[PDB]
Every structure is written in structure tokens, then in C-alpha cells.
Amino acid sequence: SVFSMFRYSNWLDKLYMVVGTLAAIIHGAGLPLMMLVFGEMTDIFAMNLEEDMTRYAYYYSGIGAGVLVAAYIQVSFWCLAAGRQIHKIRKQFFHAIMRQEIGWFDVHDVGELNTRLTDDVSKINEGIGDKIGMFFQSMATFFTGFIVGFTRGWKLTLVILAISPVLGLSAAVWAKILSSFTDKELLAYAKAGAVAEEVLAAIRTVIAFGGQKKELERYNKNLEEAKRIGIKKAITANISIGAAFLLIYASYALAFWYGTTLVLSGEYSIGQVLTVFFSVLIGAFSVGQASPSIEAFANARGAAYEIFKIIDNKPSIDSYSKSGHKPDNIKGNLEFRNVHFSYPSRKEVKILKGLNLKVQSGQTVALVGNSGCGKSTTVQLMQRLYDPTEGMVSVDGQDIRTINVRFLREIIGVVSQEPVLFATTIAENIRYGRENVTMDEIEKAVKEANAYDFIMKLPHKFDTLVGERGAQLSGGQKQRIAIARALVRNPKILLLDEATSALDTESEAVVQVALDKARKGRTTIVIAHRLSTVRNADVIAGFDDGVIVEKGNHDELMKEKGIYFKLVTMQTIPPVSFWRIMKLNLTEWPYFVVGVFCAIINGGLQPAFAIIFSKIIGVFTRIDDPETKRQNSNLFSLLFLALGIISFITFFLQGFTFGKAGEILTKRLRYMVFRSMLRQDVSWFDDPKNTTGALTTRLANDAAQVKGAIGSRLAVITQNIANLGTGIIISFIYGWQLTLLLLAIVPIIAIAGVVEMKMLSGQALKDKKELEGSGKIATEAIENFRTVVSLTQEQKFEHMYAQSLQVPYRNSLRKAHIFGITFSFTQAMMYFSYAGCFRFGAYLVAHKLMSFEDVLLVFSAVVFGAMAVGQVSSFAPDYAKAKISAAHIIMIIEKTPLIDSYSTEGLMPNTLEGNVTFGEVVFNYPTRPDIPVLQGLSLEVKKGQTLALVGSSGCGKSTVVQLLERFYDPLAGKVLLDGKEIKRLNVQWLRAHLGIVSQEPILFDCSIAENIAYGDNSRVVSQEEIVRAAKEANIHAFIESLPNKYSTKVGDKGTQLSGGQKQRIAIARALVRQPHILLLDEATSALDTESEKVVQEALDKAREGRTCIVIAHRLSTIQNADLIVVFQNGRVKEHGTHQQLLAQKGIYFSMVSVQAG
């Protein structure tokens, strides 16, 4: 449970921690040892000074070198240990994420995970770093001061000590509370990150439907809750230190009241009391030094909760286990028997009510039925993605649950219904099928899958960089690449899930011939809705209610006049000083004013304790009337109490006004940044440097890095600067000629700080540039887990992540040495200065240039700034990283796009009739400028007409759809809506009228009702309209049959539904707007013949009154089109009515002559 974050420590890390703790103890035992000679001189003061102060200077000079070594040994080893354990924890967390099963991904939300690697890990990196060394040093100083107090005093030290246990108990309680608070804060941040990645992954649909504001508010709610938690966290963290300081000062007042009895009892001398006080009081500031370390440790302990909860889990179907069975001569034989299955998300519904199947080697089985019977369900069940509730699945007699999972999945080549590619080159995507593949095999596969032509046509032939999820390829090229990826594997069992949809007739024929050439040695399962591809199948079977009903050859099933017969008959780099972020925080200026004033008050009091001590020294060395000693000293007994009451008031506010002011700004720093990328042009998201992982990592990383240096950590920096200023002013006022000696070392410390800052600033930029690359791989593997599991590429992704985590590891190791050396230098130069100042004070009192009663005061005041100097020097890395973080935040905020979604300038005509005119339009994509996709096309559409765009795959038919929505602007030519340029028209007004259906629809993680209602924004869509649209899309019956009718959540990108169901939902979403212009892009690609007829009749009924542009391959849909436009290398070569182009025996005639039985 506790100390669970150190469970990846070797012998070396334990050695590092042990030696670092010892060095911290030695280094912290330095300051209390300097008070012995202080008290001895004070007692003697109540031929010898030049004999004593010189040996005191000798001792100080020796302690200086001791500290010089000990501080480095303390800092560097702890930093190295923290870096190594952080690297191991990251690596093992990713490994444990890879080990989970598909059902776990379905039940849980993976959106949190991507933001748990970046932020949640980093917080741990602060709790187990050098902060533990600082806490150990503070504890050592506390105990050494109390030990020397015991040696020089018996009862006063015990009286002071009598109040330590309550302080420890209070610290423990507050740490426990805020550790619990940190968990909820991090959970809220995780929810915000999940929303951010969900919005960023489907940016094209969000831009198309103009739903930026709704997603912005949905993201802002979680930030508001995070701020609400952070305020309470700051409040309790501040009370933790305020109560401690108040108790310390009350204890000091009681101790002084007791010690004033020296005059009456006579047991002790004034020198002993002065020694005891001056030695004990160092612990009073050691507690304040220690508290932030406890805060950071509690934060890290609260952060490790979910990380180790995830790692501690154990899957049921583990792909990494090698304890399975495996055969050698595997023959192709598939056997389903009494398979009952239900998905984990919806356990109540039954999908397979018991089916049986037998497939022999060299056999092609086709499964035919309506949408929702469970064809893809049994395809997934074959790969052992899920385990059936009842019955068993076997290959060659042996049960699936017995043989090895990795071996079983390595002999199955699967093409899923919707291919998913990765953000790499084409060659790497092909090579992902099998690791050890030569170029010859890849060439053979891409020739067999009919993908050789367009690959050679592109520049960077086999190194062309595809986008995320293969978004930079076409709709058919993606499917061909997936087919080639499956064919590289050379599998015993091949499973195709409608791999013949996007391909046209020629490519389909080529692929079918190539596949049938080597059909004898394979076992094959094919899922298809077209029936021409099923004609040449070895055996055809029919689904109904999840159970198989029909079997046999084509002729036998036709004679059986069953489902198959019915279907056949129906078919007939600017650096910024971060002071700009300070200026951005201007609105909360009173908080800063109160914080600075309070910090000045409570920081400049510790040196003033030297003046107080000198005054109570003088009150003892009076001449007469001891009664005033009972009286005057009594006055001081009040003062120590009074300060405490102020201290509680001050040490609270100093942290609060600052701590709150950070929480206000951090939210404002995210809310704006997300408001900026949500505005950027689509071409900005095509930049390889910008990917969902990079953006989602940046969102958390920039704000966290700024908050690290901008938060309550600045309060202690201000306090310590005030302490140094008060000390130097006190030394300048009472003493003199010694402030110059103390300032003689400022240039050296300044040079050390400058060089440290320069080196850390050089390091941080290179670390930041690679952290995004580290996060991209994590998000790319997380979002496409089904494809990765099916390809068994879990080891390669883990290796790539480990390779990406390399440079930050080296930078973290080097930072340890750099920081340790600088810390030791600045910590030792000041002890050397103390020795020099003591010697010079001895000389000055020898020459009668200045008394010793006041150089005593000067030394006492100056020595109190050692811990302050240490704290100030411990602020380098935070500012070093926050500088570039603020620079990048300002850069992203100040950027403006070219096509502004938020702008209001433009023309918004009252009425439009709906003419579309493309005139001599040429266009080139930004990522591949050299490739011409459109070469001067012209398109004319009037109101109440339907245009069908046809052509070979990759001819630019969806490019016009992208252009009409103003995703990109053409290089030349003209685009006119109602005789007016779209450039002059308003962008949001243009996008609010026309609705589109993408080539591959993407939904969101919410209910079906909200998914349908998302079509029309800036309006509350009534439930009646939603139901009417669902009925018009022929999905109302299925939705109503579903338990939790309209409240069932659709999974990430719409995976809890079949392809046809979510395509119908997308059509319904597009039809809610009742758009004046409709853009259909393969809307009927995956639809049953009944849903197709219903949707077609619905669109035909309301054809008059609106404009529609359809892109399709099925010629039956194109039959009803008013006019048809044929593409040819970008140009439009044929245009006219159906009959006119029927007479002109061109490409359309070629496509219609091939669909004849």
C-alpha cells in the first residue's frame, strides 16, 4: 500500500538512497555546530580574541569543504535515483497497459490513460527527487540543534522539545488529507484530457458541424472542478505551516519565560541561555524548510494510486503468456459449436443464440444476412478477442482456450470492416504484418493487392507519409493497403470483413483473381453484402436471429428459396521572458499585492530575531534593581507570543493569495490554449509535428510546467529574498565594513547561476521536443488497440516507446550532476564568506574600529540566511523549464489562422436558392504540393437537382466536398454559391446550411440522442424531431428494441455499433438540419437492401426544394441521379442526363456493361 512507488528499486538505487541520506545528515549537521563558539564568545564577553576567533575561522573553513562535498553527494545521488525509478515506472506502466484485454478497453475509458503518462508520472518525479534529501537535511539540522542544546542546557531544551510530537502529528494529518485531495484533482484533469483527445481526434466533423463552442464548454467544466479542488488543497497546505509556526513561537515564548528565572534560581548563566536559544531556534526555520518537501511527497503518494492500480491488474486472455499449447502441422479446420455470446458493454442483450459451423481446408465460407446478426461478432470471436459464454470454438479439434494466444493470432490474417493505419510510411504499414519481411515480399504483396500503381505514382514511392489513422490516403487506397498488410502475413486462416466495398469493379476483379490463385492452401471466411463476390464461394450460409439457418451451394440455396434467394431476387522559435504571463495575470493584482506585503513581513523577521536577542542580552547586563528583570524581561515574554499570533495570520495569507492566484491563472492558461487550436485551420492539423498525442501531451505539459514555478513556490522565493535583504540591511546599519566582504562573493554565485541556467535552458528545449514524440506513440497505440492486438504488434510498440524515452533519461541523469555541483558551490562559498567575515571582525575589534558586542550581532543576523540561500538556489530548474513553457504558450495563443471560424466579418444573405458553380478550379494539397489532384474542373448545380460524381478511385470526388466546406482554398479558379464567392461569404453561416456525410463516419462517446441532436447546433433539438429523423433513416426500430432506447452510449469513434448501424445514425444526424444542400459521400456503402430502399425513398420524397450531390459506386443509386459527372485526372469529361450519357458509350457505359449477369 504505502511506499508502493519504490517497488522498482535495484541494489544500486537503494545504495544511492542510503548514501544520499547519510550525506544529507552530514550536511544538515553543519549549521547547529557553529552556534557553540557563538555562545562561548557571548558568555566570555560578559589577547584572547585574536587567539579564539582565528581558530573559530579555521573550524568554519573546514566545515566549508565538508559541506562542499556533502551537498553534492546528497543532491546528485537522490536525483539519479529519482530519474531511474521514473524511467522504470513509465516503461512498466506502458507494458501493463499493453497487457489488458479488449473487454477491459470496452468497459473503461482509455481517454484518461494518455494524460496519466504525462502529468501523473511527472508529479511523482517531484516527490521522490531531491526533496527527500532536503527534508532529511532539515531533520538533521533540527536534531543537531536540539542535541547541542542538550549538551549546553538541561531543562530549557527539554521544555522546547515538549511540543514536537504534536507538530509531527499535525504534519502527518495534513499530508494525509491533501494526498487524498490530489487523487480527485488528478481524476478531474484526466477527464478534461479525455474530452480534449476525443475532440481533437475527430476535428473534421466538429469543424463541419460547427460544434466548437459546445466542446469548449464541456472541456471547461472539468477545469472549473479542478480549480475548485486546488483552492481547498492550497488552503489546507497553508494551514499546515501556519499552525506549526504559531506553535513554535508559543513554545519559544514559554521557554523564555522559564529561562528568565536564571536571576532568581541562579542555576544557569546568561551565556548558556543564549546558546540554547540561538541553537534551538535554527530548528524553528528547519521546520519551514521541511514542510514543502512533505507537501510534494504527499502529492506523489496520492498520484501513484491509479498508476499502481492499473499495473496491479491481471488479464484473463493474456497475450504475453507463454504457458499455452501449440501444434506444428496445423491443418485448416474451423469448428463452431453451440456458441452463445454477449458483449461485455451490453450483457443483457444476446447476439449469438447458438450457432454451429464446420469449415475444411481449402474451403471458402460466405456469411449472408441483414445488419446486426453478428457476422463481425463471430469473426472477432475467432481471434479469441472475447470468450463465448457457452459452447466452444476449436481449430483442428483442439479447443481455442487451450492453445497459445500469440501463436493462434499469428496464423490468422484479418481484414476488418474499417481499416486503421498508423502514422508511419507506407512501407512500415505493410511491414507491420510480419516483422521480418524483405522488400521483395512487400512488392509481391502490393502487386497482388493491386496497390502497385498509385504507390509508384507518388513521390517518395514507398516512403510516402500517411496521416493519422490513414487520413492522408484515399478511401480505396487505404483498403488496398490493409489487404496487402493482411496478405504479407501469409496466413493459414484468412478472415475478410467486407474488404470489397471501396474498390471499384476492376480493382475488385484483380484482387479476387489474385486471391483465388492461392485459395487451395488457405482456409477462408468472407463477409459481404454484395452477391456477385459470393457467387464463386465454395459454401454460402445465412444468419438469422444470430443462428445459422441455411447451408449448401449456390444452386441448392436458390432451390431452397430461402434468405439467400430473397436477397438475390431483391438485388436482381521566439524566446519569451514569461513576464508576459505575469502581465496576463494582471487581473488578480490585489492577491499579488497582499502576498508580497505579507511575505516581506514574515521573511524579514528571522534576522530581526538577532536584534531581539541582542536586546535581551543587554537587559540582563543592567546595573541595579533585579525586580525590573522580572518586569522588563516579562515584556519580551509577550513579544514572542505576539509574533506567533501574527505568524499564523501571515504564513497563511502569504501562501493563500499566491496559491489561489496560481489556480485562477492555470485554468485561464488552458481555457485559452484549447480555444486556440480549436480555431486553427484544417491544414494545421495535417502537419506531422501536430498529432493527437502531441497536442494532448502539450496541453497538460505546458500548464503543469508553468504552474510548477508560478504557484506557491514563488512565495518562499519572495520570503527568502526578503530575508536576505533584511539581513544585509541589518548588517549595514549596526555593523559596517563587513557588508562589502559579504558582497564580495555575489559575482561568483551570479556566474554559477548564469551558467547553470544556460545549460538547463539548453537541455529543456531538447527534452520537450522529444516528450511529444514519446506521447504520440502511446496515443497511437492506445487509440488503435484492436488493430494492434489483431496484428500482435504489442512488442514493437513497447520497443518504440522505450526508444523514445531514451533522450529524456540521459538529460535527467545529466541534470543531477549539474544541479548537485551548482548547489554545492553556492552552499560552500557562503560558509567561506562566514569564515572570512569572522576573521575580519576579529581584526576590526582588535584595532578598536568597532566593538565586539555589535559584530556579534552582525554575525548572528547574517548566519540566519544560509537556509534562505539554499532555497533560492533550489529554484533553478523550475524557472529554467517554465521559461520555454511560457514562450510556447504565448506562441500558440497569439497565432491566428487564415480561415477564421470565430470571425464575424462576411456577407450573410437573408435568402439563398442553392446554385453551386465550380469554375476552372485547380487545387493542390498542402502536405503534397507537387501532386495535382484537381486540374481545372468545372461543375454546375441548380436547385432541385441531383448530381452523381463518378470516376476511378483517387480522381478527386471527395476533394470537391472538402472544398465546398472551406477546409482548404483553391490555388486558382472560382467557387460560387448563389453567384457569390464563398471567400466573401461568412464561414460559419456557410457551414450552418449544408450538411455532409463523410466517407467514414465518426461518432462520439455519448448517447445516441445527443449524437443525432449534434447535427443542428445553436438550437435545442426536440425529441420529436430526433425520432422523426431516426424513422427517416430506418434505425428507429433497432433503437427502440435496444434497452435504454436513446441513452445507450456509443463507444469511442462509434465502435459499440456495426458499420451499417452507425452509418444510418450518421445519415440521421445529417438529416436533422433539413439542409438546403446535402453532400452524400458513399452514404449507402454498407447498408442492407431494405434500409437502402427506405433511405432512398425518404431522400427522393423531399428531393424537391433542396440540392443534393452524391458520390457513389453502386449504379442503382446513380440511376436516379438527375445528372452525372465523370472524372478523368481531375478534369470533368462527361456531363449530362442519364439518357444522354447512356447514348454516349463512354466510361459510364463500361461500368454499366460489367454489372450484367
Task: Kindly list the residues in this chain that would bind ligand AGS in the complex (CB under 6 A).
Answer: 106, 343, 345-346, 351, 371-377, 417, 467, 472-477, 686, 925, 927-928, 933, 953-959, 1055-1060, 1086, 1111
Which CB, 299 or 959, lies closer to ligand AGS?
Answer: 959
Residue nearest to Mg ion (CB): 376
Is 271 a known ligand-binding residue? no
Type and span of the H or E element at 730: helix 713-733
Which CB, 74 or 378, lies closer to Mg ion?
Answer: 378
Which CB, 345 or 1116, lies closer to ligand AGS?
Answer: 345
Which CB, 306 or 418, lies closer to ligand AGS?
Answer: 418
Is 1007 a known ligand-binding residue? no
How far is residue 570's CA from residue 577's CA, in Å, rounded to a whole number?
71
Q: Which stretch binds Mg ion (CB under 5 A): 389-397, 409-417, 1090-1098, 1124-1132?
A: 409-417
Is 370 a known ligand-binding residue? yes
**Residue 516: helix, strand or coil by DSSP?**
helix
How far is residue 348's CA from residue 970's CA, in Å, rounded to a whole number?
52
Which CB, 149 or 374, lies closer to ligand AGS?
Answer: 374
Work out how close the CB of 1035 gets to ligand AGS at its nearest, in angstroms, rounded to a whole number: 11
Is 131 a known ligand-binding residue? no
| Alpha helices (H) along 951-1088 | 958-964, 987-993, 1008-1013, 1023-1032, 1036-1041, 1059-1071
Is 374 a known ligand-binding residue? yes
Q: Which stretch binds Mg ion (CB under 5 A): 412-420, 554-562, 620-628, 722-730?
A: 412-420
Work out how close the CB of 346 gets to ligand AGS at its nearest, in angstroms, rounded to a whole number: 5
Please choose which of ligand AGS, Mg ion, none residue 933 contacts, taking the beta carbon within 5 to 8 angstroms, the exact cut-off set by kind.
ligand AGS
Work out how close the CB of 471 gets to ligand AGS at its nearest, in angstroms, rounded to a whole number: 6
Burial grade of 610 (CB within 10 A; 0-12, 13-18, 19 or more): buried
Query: What DSSP state is assigned to residue 349?
Result: S
C-alpha 413: how far from chain center: 33
Per-residue contact string for residues 454-483; x = within reach of Mg ion by CB under 5 A? --------------------xx--------
Work out how close the CB of 958 gets to ligand AGS at its nearest, in angstroms, rounded to a whole number: 3
915-949: b (≥16 Cβ within 10 Å) or e: bbbbeebebbbeebeeebbbebbebbbebebbbbb
Is 662 a known ligand-binding residue? no
**Residue 657: helix, strand or coil by DSSP?**
helix
Which of 92, 170, 370, 417 binds Mg ion (CB under 5 A)? It is: 417
Please choose which of ligand AGS, Mg ion, none residue 710 contacts, taking the beta carbon within 5 to 8 angstroms, the exact cut-off set by kind.
none
514's grid cell: 489474385
Which CB, 285 or 386, lies closer to ligand AGS?
Answer: 386
Which CB, 733 or 972, lies closer to ligand AGS?
Answer: 972
Is 595 a known ligand-binding residue? no
458's grid cell: 507518388
How far is residue 862's CA from residue 728's CA, in Å, rounded to a whole number?
7
Please choose which of Mg ion, ligand AGS, none residue 662 contacts, taking the beta carbon within 5 to 8 angstroms, the exact cut-off set by kind.
none
State which amino acid sits at residue 1106. R
Is 951 a known ligand-binding residue? yes
How far is residue 902's CA from residue 57's CA, in Å, rounded to a whole number?
70
**Residue 938: helix, strand or coil by DSSP?**
strand
Q: Which stretch binds Mg ion (CB under 5 A): 119-127, 327-335, 433-441, 951-959?
A: 951-959
The DSSP annotation for 7-72 comes to TT--HHHHHHHHHHHHHHHHHHTSGGGGHHHHHHHHHHH---HHHHHHHHHHHHHHHHHHHHHHHH
Work out how close the CB of 706 gets to Mg ion at its nearest, in angstroms, rounded to a whole number: 45
Query: What DSSP state is assigned to residue 118?
Result: I
Closest Cα partner for 951 from 1124, 1139, 1143?
Answer: 1124
Please choose which of Mg ion, ligand AGS, none residue 959 contacts, taking the beta carbon within 5 to 8 angstroms, the exact cut-off set by kind.
ligand AGS
Work out how close the CB of 1050 gets to ligand AGS at its nearest, in angstroms, rounded to a whole number: 9
Please choose which of Mg ion, ligand AGS, none residue 220 contacts, taking the beta carbon within 5 to 8 angstroms, the exact cut-off set by kind.
none
Please choose which of Mg ion, ligand AGS, none residue 935 contacts, taking the beta carbon within 5 to 8 angstroms, the exact cut-off set by kind.
none
Is 1058 a known ligand-binding residue? no
Please choose which of Mg ion, ligand AGS, none residue 726 contacts, taking the beta carbon within 5 to 8 angstroms, the exact cut-off set by kind.
none
Radius of gyration of the chain (CA): 38
Please choose which of ligand AGS, Mg ion, none residue 373 contacts, taking the beta carbon within 5 to 8 angstroms, the exact cut-off set by kind.
ligand AGS
1126 Cβ neighbours under 8 A, 6+ residues apart: 950, 951, 1132, 1133, 1134, 1135, 1141, 1146, 1147, 1148
Please choose which of Mg ion, ligand AGS, none residue 283 contacts, taking the beta carbon within 5 to 8 angstroms, the exact cut-off set by kind.
none
Which of 170, 342, 361, 376 binds Mg ion (CB under 5 A)? It is: 376
State which amino acid sits at residue 217. E
Q: Does 1054 bind Mg ion (CB under 5 A)?
A: no
Distances (CA, A) of 549 to 236, 354, 542, 543, 564: 68, 11, 6, 6, 10
Work out how close the CB of 1143 gets to ligand AGS at its nearest, in angstroms, rounded to a whole number: 25
Work out how close the CB of 957 gets to ligand AGS at its nearest, in angstroms, rounded to a whole number: 3
Site for Mg ion in 5-24 (CB under 5 A): none
How far is residue 56's CA from residue 275's CA, in Å, rounded to a whole number?
16
Which CB, 542 or 655, lies closer to ligand AGS?
Answer: 542
625 Cβ neighbours under 8 A, 6+ residues apart: none
Which CB, 372 or 693, lies closer to ligand AGS?
Answer: 372
How far is residue 405's CA from residue 388's CA, in Å, rounded to a whole number?
15
Work out how close the CB of 473 gets to Mg ion at its nearest, in angstroms, rounded to a whole number: 10
What is the CB neighbour count within 10 angstroms for residue 474? Answer: 21
Is 369 a known ligand-binding residue? yes
What is the CB neighbour count within 10 angstroms for residue 265? Answer: 7
Binding residues for Mg ion, rule CB under 5 A, total 5
Is 9 a known ligand-binding residue? no
Is 373 a known ligand-binding residue? yes
Is 958 a known ligand-binding residue? yes
Work out how close the CB of 1059 gets to Mg ion at its nearest, in angstroms, rounded to a whole number: 5
Please choose which of Mg ion, ligand AGS, none residue 507 contacts, taking the beta carbon within 5 to 8 angstroms, the exact cut-off set by kind.
none
Work out how close the CB of 1084 gets to ligand AGS at its nearest, in angstroms, rounded to a whole number: 12
Which CB, 374 or 644, lies closer to ligand AGS?
Answer: 374
Q: Cα-flanking dihedrals φ and ψ of residue 339, to 5°? A: -85, 115
Which CB, 296 or 1035, lies closer to ligand AGS?
Answer: 1035
342 Cβ neighbours under 8 A, 6+ residues apart: 348, 349, 350, 351, 389
CA dihedral 342, 344, 345, 346 (to 10 degrees): 30
Work out how close the CB of 528 gets to ligand AGS at its nearest, in angstroms, rounded to a whole number: 9
Contact between 105 and 172 under an 8 Å Cβ cutoff? The reply is no
Which CB, 67 or 1087, lies closer to Mg ion?
Answer: 1087
Closest Cα partner for 491 from 413, 437, 547, 422?
Answer: 413
Is 836 a known ligand-binding residue? no
**Residue 995: helix, strand or coil by DSSP?**
strand
Work out how close the CB of 1091 gets to Mg ion at its nearest, in angstroms, rounded to a whole number: 14
Work out how close the CB of 127 gets to ligand AGS at its nearest, in angstroms, rounded to a whole number: 39
Q: What does the H/E/C string look like for 455-502?
A: HHHCCCCCCCECCHHHCCCCHHHHHHHHHHHHHHCCCCEEEEECCCCC
Q: Which stretch binds Mg ion (CB under 5 A): 5-13, 53-61, 948-956, 1002-1010?
A: 948-956
Which CB, 333 or 376, lies closer to Mg ion?
Answer: 376
Beta bridge partners of 1079: 996, 1109
Please choose which of Mg ion, ligand AGS, none residue 292 contacts, taking the beta carbon within 5 to 8 angstroms, the exact cut-off set by kind.
none
How far is residue 21's CA from residue 371's CA, in Å, rounded to a whole number?
67
Binding positions for ATP: 369-376, 951-958
Binding positions: 369-376, 951-958
Q: Which residues contribute to the site for Mg ion (CB under 5 A)? A: 376, 417, 474-475, 953
